[PDB]
PDB file of C-alpha atoms and ligand atoms in Angstrom:
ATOM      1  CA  UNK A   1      -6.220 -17.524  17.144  1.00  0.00           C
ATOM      2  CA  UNK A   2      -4.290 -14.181  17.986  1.00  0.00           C
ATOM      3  CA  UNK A   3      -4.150 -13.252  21.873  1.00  0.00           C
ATOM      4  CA  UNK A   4      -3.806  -9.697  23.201  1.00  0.00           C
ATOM      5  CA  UNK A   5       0.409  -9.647  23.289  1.00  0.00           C
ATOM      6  CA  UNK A   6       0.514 -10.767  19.544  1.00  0.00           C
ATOM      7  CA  UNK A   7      -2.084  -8.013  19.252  1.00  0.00           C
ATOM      8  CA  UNK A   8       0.361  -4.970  20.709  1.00  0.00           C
ATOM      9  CA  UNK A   9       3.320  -6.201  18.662  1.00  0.00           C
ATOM     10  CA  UNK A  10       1.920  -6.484  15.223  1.00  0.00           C
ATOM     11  CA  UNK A  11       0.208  -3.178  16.676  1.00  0.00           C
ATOM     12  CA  UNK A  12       3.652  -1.948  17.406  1.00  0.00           C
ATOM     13  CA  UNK A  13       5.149  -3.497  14.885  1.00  0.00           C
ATOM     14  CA  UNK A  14       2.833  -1.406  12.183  1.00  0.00           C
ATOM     15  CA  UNK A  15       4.011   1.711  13.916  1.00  0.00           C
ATOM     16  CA  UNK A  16       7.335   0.851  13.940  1.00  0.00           C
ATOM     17  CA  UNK A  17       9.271  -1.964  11.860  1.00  0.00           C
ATOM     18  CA  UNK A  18      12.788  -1.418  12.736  1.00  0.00           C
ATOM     19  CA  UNK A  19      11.984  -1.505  16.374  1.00  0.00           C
ATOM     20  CA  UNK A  20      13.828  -4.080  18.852  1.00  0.00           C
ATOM     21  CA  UNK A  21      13.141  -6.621  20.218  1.00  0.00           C
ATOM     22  CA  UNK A  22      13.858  -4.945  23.708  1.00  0.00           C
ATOM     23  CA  UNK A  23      12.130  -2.358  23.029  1.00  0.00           C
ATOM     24  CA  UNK A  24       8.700  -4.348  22.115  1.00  0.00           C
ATOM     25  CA  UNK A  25       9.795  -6.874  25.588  1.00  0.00           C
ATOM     26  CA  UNK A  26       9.199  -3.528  27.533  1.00  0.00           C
ATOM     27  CA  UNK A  27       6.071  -3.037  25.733  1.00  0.00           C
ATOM     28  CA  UNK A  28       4.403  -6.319  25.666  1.00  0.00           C
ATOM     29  CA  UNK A  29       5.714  -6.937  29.858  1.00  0.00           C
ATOM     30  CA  UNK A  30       8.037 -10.352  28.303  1.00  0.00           C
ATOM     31  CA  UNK A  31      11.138 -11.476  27.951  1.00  0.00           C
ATOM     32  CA  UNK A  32      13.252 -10.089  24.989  1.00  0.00           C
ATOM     33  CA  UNK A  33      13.087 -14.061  24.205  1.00  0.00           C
ATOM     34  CA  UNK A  34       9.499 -14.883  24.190  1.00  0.00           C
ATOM     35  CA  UNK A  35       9.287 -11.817  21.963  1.00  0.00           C
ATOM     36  CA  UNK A  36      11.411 -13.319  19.052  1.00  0.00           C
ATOM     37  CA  UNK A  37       9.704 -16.207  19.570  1.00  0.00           C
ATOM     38  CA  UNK A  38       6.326 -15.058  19.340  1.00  0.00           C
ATOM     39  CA  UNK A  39       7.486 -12.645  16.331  1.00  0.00           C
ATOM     40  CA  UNK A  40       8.790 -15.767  14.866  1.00  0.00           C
ATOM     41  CA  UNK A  41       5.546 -16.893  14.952  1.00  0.00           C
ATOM     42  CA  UNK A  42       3.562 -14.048  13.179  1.00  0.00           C
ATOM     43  CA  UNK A  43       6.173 -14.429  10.565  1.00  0.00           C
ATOM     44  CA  UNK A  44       5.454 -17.819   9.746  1.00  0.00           C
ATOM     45  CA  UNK A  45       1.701 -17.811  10.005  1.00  0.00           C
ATOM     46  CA  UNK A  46       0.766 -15.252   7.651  1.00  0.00           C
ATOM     47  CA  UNK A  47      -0.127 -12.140   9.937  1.00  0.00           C
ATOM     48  CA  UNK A  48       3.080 -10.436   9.018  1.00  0.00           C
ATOM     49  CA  UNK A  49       4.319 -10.714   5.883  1.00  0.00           C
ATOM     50  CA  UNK A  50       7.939  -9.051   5.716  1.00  0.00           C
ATOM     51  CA  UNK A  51       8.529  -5.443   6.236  1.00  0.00           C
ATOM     52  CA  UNK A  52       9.529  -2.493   4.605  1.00  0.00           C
ATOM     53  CA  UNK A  53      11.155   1.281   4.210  1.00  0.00           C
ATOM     54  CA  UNK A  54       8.195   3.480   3.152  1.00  0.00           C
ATOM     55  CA  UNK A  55       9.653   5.098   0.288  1.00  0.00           C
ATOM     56  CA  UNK A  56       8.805   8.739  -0.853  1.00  0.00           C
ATOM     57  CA  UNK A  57       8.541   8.155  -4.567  1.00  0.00           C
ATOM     58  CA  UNK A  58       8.531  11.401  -5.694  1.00  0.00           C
ATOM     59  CA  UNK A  59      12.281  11.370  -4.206  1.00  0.00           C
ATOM     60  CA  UNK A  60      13.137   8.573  -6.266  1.00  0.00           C
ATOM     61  CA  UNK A  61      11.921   9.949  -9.513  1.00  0.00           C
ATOM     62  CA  UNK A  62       8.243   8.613  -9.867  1.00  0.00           C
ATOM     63  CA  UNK A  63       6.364  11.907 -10.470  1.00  0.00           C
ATOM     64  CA  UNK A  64       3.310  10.247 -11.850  1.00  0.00           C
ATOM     65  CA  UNK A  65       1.115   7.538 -10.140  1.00  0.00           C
ATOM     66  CA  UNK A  66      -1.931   5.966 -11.547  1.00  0.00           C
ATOM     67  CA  UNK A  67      -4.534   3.023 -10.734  1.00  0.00           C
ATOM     68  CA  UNK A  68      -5.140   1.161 -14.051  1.00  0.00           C
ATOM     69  CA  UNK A  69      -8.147  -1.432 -14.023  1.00  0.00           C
ATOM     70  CA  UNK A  70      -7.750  -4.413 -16.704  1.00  0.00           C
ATOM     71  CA  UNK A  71     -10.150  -6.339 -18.411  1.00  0.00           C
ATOM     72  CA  UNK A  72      -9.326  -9.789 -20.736  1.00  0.00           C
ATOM     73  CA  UNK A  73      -9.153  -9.274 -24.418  1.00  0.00           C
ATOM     74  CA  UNK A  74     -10.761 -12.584 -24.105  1.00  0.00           C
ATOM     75  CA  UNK A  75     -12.302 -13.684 -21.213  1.00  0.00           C
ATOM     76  CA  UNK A  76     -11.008 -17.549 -21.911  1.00  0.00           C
ATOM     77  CA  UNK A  77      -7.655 -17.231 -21.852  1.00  0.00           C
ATOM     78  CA  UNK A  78      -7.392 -18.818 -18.469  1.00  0.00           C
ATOM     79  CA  UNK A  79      -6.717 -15.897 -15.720  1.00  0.00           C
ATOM     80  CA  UNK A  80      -3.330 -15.060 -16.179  1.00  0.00           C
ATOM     81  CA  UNK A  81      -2.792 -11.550 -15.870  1.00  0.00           C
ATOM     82  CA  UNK A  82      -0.796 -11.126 -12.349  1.00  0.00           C
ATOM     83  CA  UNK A  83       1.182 -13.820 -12.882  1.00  0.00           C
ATOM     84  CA  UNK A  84       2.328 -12.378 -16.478  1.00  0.00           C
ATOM     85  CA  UNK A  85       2.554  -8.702 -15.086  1.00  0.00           C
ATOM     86  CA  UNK A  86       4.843  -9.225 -12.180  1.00  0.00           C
ATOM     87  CA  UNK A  87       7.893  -8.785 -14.302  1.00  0.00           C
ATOM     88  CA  UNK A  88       6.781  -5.557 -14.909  1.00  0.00           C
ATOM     89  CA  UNK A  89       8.523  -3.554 -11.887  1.00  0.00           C
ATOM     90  CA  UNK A  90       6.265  -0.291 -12.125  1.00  0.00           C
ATOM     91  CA  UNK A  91       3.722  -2.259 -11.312  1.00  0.00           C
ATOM     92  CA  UNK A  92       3.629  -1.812  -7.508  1.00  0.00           C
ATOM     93  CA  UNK A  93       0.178  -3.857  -6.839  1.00  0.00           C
ATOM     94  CA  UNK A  94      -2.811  -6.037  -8.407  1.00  0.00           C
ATOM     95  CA  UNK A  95      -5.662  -6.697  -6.930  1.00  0.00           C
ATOM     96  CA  UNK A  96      -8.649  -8.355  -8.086  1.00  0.00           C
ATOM     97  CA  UNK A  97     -11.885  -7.111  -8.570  1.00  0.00           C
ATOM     98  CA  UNK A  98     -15.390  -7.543  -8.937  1.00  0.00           C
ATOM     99  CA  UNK A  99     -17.695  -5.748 -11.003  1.00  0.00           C
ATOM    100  CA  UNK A 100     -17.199  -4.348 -14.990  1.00  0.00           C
ATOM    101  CA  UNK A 101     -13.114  -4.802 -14.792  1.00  0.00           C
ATOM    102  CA  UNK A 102     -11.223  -7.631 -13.425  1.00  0.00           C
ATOM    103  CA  UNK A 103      -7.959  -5.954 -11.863  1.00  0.00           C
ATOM    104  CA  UNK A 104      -6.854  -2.950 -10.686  1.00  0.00           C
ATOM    105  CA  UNK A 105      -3.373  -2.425 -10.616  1.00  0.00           C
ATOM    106  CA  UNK A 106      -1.164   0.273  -9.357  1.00  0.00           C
ATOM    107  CA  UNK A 107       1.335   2.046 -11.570  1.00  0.00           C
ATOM    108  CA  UNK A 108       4.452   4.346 -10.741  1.00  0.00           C
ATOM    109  CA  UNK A 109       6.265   6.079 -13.597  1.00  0.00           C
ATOM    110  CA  UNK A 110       8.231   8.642 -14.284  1.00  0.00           C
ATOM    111  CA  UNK A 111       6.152  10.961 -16.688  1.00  0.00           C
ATOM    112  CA  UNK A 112       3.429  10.983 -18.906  1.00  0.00           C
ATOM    113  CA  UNK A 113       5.175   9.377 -21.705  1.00  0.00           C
ATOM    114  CA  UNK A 114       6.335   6.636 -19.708  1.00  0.00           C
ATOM    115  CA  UNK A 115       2.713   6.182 -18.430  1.00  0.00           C
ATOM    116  CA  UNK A 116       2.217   5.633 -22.540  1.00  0.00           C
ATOM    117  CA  UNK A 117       4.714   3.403 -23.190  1.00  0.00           C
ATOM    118  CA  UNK A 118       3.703   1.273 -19.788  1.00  0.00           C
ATOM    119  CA  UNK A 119      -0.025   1.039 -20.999  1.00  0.00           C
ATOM    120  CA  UNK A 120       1.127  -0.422 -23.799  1.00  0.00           C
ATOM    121  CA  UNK A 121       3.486  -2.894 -22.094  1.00  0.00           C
ATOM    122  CA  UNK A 122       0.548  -3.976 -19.828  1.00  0.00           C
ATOM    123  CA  UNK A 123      -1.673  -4.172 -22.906  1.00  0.00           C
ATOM    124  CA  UNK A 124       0.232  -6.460 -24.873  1.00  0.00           C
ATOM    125  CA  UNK A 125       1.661  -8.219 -21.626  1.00  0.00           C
ATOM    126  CA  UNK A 126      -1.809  -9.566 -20.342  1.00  0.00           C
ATOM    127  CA  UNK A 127      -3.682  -8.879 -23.162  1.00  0.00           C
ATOM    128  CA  UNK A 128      -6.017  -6.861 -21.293  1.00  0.00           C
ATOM    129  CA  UNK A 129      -7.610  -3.250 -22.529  1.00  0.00           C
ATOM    130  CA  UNK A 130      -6.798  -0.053 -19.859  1.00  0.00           C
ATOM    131  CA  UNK A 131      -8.825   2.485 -18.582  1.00  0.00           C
ATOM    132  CA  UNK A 132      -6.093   4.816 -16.007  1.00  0.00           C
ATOM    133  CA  UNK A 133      -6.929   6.806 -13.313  1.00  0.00           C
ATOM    134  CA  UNK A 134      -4.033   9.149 -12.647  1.00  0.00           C
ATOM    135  CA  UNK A 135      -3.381  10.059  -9.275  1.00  0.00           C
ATOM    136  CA  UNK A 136      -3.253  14.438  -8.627  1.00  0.00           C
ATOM    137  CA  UNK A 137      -2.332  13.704  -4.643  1.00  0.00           C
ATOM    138  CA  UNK A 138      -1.774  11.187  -1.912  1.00  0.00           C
ATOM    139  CA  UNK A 139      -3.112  12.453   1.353  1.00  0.00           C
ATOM    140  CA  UNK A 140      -2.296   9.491   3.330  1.00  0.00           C
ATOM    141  CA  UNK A 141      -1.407   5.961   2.698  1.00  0.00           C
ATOM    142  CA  UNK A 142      -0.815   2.351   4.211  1.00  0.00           C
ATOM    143  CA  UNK A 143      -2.228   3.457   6.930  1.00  0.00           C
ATOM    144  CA  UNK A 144      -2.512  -0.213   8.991  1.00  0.00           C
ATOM    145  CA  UNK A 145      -5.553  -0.360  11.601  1.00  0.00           C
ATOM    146  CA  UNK A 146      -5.194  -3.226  14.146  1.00  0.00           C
ATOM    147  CA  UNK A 147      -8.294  -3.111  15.656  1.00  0.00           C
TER     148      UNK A 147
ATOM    149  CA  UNK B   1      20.907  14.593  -5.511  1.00  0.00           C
ATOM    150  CA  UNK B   2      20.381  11.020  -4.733  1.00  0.00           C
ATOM    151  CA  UNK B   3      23.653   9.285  -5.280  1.00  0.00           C
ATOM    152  CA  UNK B   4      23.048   6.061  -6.239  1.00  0.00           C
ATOM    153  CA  UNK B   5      25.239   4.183  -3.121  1.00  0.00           C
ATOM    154  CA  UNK B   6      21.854   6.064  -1.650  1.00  0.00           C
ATOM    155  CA  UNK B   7      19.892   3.876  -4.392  1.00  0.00           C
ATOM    156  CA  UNK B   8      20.626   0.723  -3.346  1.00  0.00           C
ATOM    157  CA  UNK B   9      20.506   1.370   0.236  1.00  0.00           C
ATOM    158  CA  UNK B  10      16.807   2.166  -0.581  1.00  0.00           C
ATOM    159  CA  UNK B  11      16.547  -0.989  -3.035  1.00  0.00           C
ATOM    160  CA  UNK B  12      17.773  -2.544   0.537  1.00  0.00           C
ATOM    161  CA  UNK B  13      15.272  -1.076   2.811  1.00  0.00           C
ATOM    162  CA  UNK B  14      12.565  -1.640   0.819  1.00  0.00           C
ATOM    163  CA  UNK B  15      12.744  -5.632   0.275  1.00  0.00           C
ATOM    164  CA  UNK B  16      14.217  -5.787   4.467  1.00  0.00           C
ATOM    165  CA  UNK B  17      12.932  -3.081   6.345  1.00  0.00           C
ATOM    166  CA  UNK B  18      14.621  -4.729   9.688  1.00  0.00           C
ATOM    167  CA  UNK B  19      18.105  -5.610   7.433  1.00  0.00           C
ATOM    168  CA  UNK B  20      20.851  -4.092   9.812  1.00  0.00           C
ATOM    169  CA  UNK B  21      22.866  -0.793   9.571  1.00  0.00           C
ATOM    170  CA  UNK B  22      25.480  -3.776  10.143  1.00  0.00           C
ATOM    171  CA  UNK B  23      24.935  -6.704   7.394  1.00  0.00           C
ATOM    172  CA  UNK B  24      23.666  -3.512   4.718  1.00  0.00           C
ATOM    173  CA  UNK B  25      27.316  -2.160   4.489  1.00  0.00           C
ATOM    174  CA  UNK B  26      28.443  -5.370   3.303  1.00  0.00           C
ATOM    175  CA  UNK B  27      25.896  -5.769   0.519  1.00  0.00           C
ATOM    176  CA  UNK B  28      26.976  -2.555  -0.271  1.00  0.00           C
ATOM    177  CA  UNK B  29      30.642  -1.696  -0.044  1.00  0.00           C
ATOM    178  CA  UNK B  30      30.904   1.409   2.654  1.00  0.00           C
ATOM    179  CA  UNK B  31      31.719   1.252   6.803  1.00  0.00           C
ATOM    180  CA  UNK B  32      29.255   0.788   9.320  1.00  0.00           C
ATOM    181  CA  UNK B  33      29.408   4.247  10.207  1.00  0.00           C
ATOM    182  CA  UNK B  34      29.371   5.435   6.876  1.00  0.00           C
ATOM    183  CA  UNK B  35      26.040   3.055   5.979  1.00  0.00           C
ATOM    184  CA  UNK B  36      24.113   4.532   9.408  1.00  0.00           C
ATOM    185  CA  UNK B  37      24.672   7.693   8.479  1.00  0.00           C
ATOM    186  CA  UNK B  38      23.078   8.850   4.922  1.00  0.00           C
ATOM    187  CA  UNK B  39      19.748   6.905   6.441  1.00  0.00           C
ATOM    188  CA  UNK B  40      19.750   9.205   9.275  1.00  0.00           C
ATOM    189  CA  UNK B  41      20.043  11.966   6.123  1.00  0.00           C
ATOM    190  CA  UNK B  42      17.687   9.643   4.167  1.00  0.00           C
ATOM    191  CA  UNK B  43      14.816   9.748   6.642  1.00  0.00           C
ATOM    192  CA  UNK B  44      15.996  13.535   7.200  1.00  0.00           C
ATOM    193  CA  UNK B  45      15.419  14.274   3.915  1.00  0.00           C
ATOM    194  CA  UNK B  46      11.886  12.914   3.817  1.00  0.00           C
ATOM    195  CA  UNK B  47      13.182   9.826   1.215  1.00  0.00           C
ATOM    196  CA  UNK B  48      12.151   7.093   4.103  1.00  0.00           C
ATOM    197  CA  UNK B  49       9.375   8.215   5.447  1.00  0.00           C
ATOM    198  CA  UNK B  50       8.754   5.870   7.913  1.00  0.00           C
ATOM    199  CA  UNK B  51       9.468   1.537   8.884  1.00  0.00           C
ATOM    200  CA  UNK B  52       6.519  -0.810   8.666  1.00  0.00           C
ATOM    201  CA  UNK B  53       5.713  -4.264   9.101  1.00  0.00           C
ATOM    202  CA  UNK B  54       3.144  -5.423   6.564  1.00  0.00           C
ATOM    203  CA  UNK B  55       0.310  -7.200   8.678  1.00  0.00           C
ATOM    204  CA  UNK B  56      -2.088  -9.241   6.562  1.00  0.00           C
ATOM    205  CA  UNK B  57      -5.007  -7.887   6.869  1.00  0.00           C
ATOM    206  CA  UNK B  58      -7.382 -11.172   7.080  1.00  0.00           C
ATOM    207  CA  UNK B  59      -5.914 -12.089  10.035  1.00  0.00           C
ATOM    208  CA  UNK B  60      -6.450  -9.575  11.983  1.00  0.00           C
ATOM    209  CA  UNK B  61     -10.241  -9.323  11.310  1.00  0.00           C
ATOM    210  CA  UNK B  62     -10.688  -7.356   7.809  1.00  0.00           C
ATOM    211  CA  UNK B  63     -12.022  -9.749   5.315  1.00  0.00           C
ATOM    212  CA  UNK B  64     -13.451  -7.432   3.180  1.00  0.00           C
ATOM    213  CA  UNK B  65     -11.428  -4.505   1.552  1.00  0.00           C
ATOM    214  CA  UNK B  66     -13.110  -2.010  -1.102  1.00  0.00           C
ATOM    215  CA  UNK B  67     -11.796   0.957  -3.324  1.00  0.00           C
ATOM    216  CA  UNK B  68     -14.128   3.660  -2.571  1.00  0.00           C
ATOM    217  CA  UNK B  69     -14.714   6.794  -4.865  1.00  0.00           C
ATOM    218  CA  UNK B  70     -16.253   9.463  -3.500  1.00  0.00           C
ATOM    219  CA  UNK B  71     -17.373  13.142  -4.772  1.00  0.00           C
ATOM    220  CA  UNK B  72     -18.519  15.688  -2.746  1.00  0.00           C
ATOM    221  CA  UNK B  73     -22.016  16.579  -3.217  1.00  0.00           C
ATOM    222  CA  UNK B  74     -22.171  20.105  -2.497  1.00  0.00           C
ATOM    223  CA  UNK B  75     -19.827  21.830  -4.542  1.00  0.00           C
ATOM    224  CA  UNK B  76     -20.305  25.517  -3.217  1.00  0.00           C
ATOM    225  CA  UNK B  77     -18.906  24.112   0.539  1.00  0.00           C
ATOM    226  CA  UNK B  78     -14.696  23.881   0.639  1.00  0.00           C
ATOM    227  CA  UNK B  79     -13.788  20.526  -0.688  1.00  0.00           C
ATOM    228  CA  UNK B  80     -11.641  19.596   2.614  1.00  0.00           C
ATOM    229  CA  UNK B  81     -12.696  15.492   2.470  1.00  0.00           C
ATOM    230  CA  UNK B  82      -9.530  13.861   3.390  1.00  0.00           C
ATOM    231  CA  UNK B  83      -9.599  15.983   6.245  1.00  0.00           C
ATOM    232  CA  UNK B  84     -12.733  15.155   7.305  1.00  0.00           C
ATOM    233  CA  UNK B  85     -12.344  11.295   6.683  1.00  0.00           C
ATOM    234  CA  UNK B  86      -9.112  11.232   8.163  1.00  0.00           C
ATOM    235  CA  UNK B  87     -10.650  10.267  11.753  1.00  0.00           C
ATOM    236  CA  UNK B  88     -12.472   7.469  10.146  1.00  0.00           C
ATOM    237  CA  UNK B  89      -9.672   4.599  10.816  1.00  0.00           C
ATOM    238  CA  UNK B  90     -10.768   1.793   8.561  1.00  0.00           C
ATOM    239  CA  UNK B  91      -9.799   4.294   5.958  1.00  0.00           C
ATOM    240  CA  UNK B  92      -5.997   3.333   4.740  1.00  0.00           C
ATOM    241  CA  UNK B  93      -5.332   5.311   1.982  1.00  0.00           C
ATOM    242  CA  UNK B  94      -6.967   8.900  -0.043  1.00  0.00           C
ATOM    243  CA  UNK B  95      -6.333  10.143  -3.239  1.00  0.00           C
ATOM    244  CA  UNK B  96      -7.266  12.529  -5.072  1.00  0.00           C
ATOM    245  CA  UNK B  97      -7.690  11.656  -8.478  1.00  0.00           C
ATOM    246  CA  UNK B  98      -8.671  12.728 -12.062  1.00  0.00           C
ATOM    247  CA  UNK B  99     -11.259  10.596 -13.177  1.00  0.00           C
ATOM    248  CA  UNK B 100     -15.050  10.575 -12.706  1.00  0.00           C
ATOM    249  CA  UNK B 101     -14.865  10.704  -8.821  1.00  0.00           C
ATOM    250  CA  UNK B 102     -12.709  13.552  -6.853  1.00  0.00           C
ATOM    251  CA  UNK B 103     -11.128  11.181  -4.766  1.00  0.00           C
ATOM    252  CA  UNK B 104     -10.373   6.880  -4.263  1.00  0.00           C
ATOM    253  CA  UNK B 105     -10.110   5.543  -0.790  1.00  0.00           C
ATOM    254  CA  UNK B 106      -8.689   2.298   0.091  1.00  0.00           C
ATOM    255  CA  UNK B 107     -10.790   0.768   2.933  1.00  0.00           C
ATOM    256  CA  UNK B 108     -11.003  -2.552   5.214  1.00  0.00           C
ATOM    257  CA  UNK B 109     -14.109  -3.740   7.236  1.00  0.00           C
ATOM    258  CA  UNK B 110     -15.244  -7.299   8.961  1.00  0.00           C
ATOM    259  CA  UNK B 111     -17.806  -7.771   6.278  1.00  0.00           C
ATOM    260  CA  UNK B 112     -20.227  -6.921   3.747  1.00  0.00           C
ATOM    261  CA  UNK B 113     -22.611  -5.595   5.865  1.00  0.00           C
ATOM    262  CA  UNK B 114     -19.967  -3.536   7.972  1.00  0.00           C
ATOM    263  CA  UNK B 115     -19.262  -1.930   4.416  1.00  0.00           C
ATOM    264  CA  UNK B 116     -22.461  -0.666   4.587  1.00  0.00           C
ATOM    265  CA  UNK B 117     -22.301   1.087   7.900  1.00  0.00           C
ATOM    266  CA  UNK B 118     -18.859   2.368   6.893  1.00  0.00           C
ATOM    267  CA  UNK B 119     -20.230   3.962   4.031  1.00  0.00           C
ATOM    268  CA  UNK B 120     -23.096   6.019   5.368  1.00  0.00           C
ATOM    269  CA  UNK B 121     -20.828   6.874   7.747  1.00  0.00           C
ATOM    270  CA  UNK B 122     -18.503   8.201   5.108  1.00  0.00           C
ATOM    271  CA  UNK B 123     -21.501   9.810   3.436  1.00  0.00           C
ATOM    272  CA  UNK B 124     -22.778  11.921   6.340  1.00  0.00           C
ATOM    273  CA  UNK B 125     -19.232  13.074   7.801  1.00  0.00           C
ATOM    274  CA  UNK B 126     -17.220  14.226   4.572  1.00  0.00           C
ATOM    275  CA  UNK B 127     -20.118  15.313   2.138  1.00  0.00           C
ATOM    276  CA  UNK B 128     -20.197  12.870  -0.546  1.00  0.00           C
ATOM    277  CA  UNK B 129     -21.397  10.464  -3.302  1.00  0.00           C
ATOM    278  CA  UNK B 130     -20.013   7.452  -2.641  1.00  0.00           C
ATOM    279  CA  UNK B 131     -19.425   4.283  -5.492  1.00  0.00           C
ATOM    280  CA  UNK B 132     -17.419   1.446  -4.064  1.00  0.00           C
ATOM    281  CA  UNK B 133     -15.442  -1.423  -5.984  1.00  0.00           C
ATOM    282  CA  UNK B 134     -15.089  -4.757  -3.504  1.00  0.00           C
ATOM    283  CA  UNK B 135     -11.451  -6.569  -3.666  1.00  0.00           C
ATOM    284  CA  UNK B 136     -11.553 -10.060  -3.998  1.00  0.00           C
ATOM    285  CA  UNK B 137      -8.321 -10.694  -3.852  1.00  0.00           C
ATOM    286  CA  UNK B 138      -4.487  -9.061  -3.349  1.00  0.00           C
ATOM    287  CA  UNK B 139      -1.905 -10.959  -5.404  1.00  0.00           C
ATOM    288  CA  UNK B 140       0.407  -8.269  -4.475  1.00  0.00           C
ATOM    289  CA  UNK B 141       0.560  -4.979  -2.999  1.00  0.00           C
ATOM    290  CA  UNK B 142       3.459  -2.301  -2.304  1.00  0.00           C
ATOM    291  CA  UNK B 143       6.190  -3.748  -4.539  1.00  0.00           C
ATOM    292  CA  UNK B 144       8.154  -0.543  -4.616  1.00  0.00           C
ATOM    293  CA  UNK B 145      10.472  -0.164  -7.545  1.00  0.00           C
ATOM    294  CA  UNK B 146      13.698   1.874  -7.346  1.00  0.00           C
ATOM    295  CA  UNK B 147      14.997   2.985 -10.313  1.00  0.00           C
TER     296      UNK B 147
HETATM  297  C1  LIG C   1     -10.882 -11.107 -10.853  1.00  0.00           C
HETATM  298  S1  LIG C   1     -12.242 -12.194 -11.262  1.00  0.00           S
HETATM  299  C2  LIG C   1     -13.228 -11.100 -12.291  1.00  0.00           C
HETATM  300  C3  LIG C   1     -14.476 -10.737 -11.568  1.00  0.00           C
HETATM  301  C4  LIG C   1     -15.476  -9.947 -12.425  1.00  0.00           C
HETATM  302  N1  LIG C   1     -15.066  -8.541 -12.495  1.00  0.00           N
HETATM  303  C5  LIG C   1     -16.911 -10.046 -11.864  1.00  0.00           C
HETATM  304  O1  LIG C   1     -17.419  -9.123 -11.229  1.00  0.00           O
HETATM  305  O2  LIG C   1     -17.624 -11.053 -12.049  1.00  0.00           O
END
């Protein structure tokens, strides 16, 4: 249930958040009406979900990134582990997973004593044990494909 | 250098990516000419890279995402992978990493089975190992923390 005008915005949108609403009228061939309308409905369906600044974060101070995968202490605590981590504001995302670990998360710190002191705020937070990939380089990220 | 009236118009760009060079500089206490200009400086700078809206990814087709490590197989040939992947579009995201693999891709696909293709296709363009970890699930993803 998404036709081909919903397709260019949330295309458009993608490439361009703080684009206007006339702006993405000229685009789709519509009113600058029937395009808030129909971007109000994207937002309320779940196809787009809010929108953001891409922030350099080496700018702000986080020179060291790292994914962290997380496995239960004990596997019978019922799954709590994103809930109980999302206080933790370096943690930037959690996904589940399937194979020998149950979560990956994504970490931003400033250094590599802070990634020490954070390992052992997740550890005892989730009761979970680590293992960290640290990131060397980004190359490219987020990049959205709306196929 | 990033004065922190800079700070929290970056704390306010990256929860409201379409919040307004108007109704910012009342959340935070400078003119509306004041407020538009440091973001022109801010994306000058590269501190915002860039304005996205953050399209769910189900709903436009991609019910299966995967982290995929890969390592180049030959290692007497330059190790220019992210370069060579970069055309592929259902890759998002490359890092390079220190860990057991050289690099981590984050990658979306209709399915199981159009994981396989992608990956033999990832195989025979860059030249590379590949050992891929299937998401089941995102509880959250890109919340960026500003100091
Ligand atoms: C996040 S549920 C844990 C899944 C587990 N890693 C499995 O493969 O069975």
């Amino acid at each position: 249930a998404l036709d081909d005008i919903d397709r260019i915005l949330v295309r458009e949108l993608a490439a361009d958040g703080r684009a206007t609403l006339s702006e993405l009228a000229t685009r789709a061939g519509l009113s600058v009406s029937a395009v808030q309308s129909r971007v109000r409905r994207l937002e309320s369906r779940g196809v787009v979900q809010g929108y953001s600044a891409r922030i350099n974060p080496e700018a702000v101070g986080h020179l060291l990134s790292a994914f962290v995968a997380i496995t239960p202490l004990d596997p019978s605590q019922p799954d709590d582990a994103p809930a109980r981590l999302e206080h933790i504001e370096e943690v930037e995302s959690c996904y589940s997973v399937a194979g020998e670990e149950s979560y990956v998360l994504l970490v931003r710190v400033a250094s590599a004593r802070a990634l020490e002191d954070l390992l052992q705020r997740i550890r005892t937070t989730a009761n979970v044990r680590t293992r960290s990939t640290i990131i060397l380089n980004t190359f490219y990220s987020d990049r959205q494909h709306i196929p």
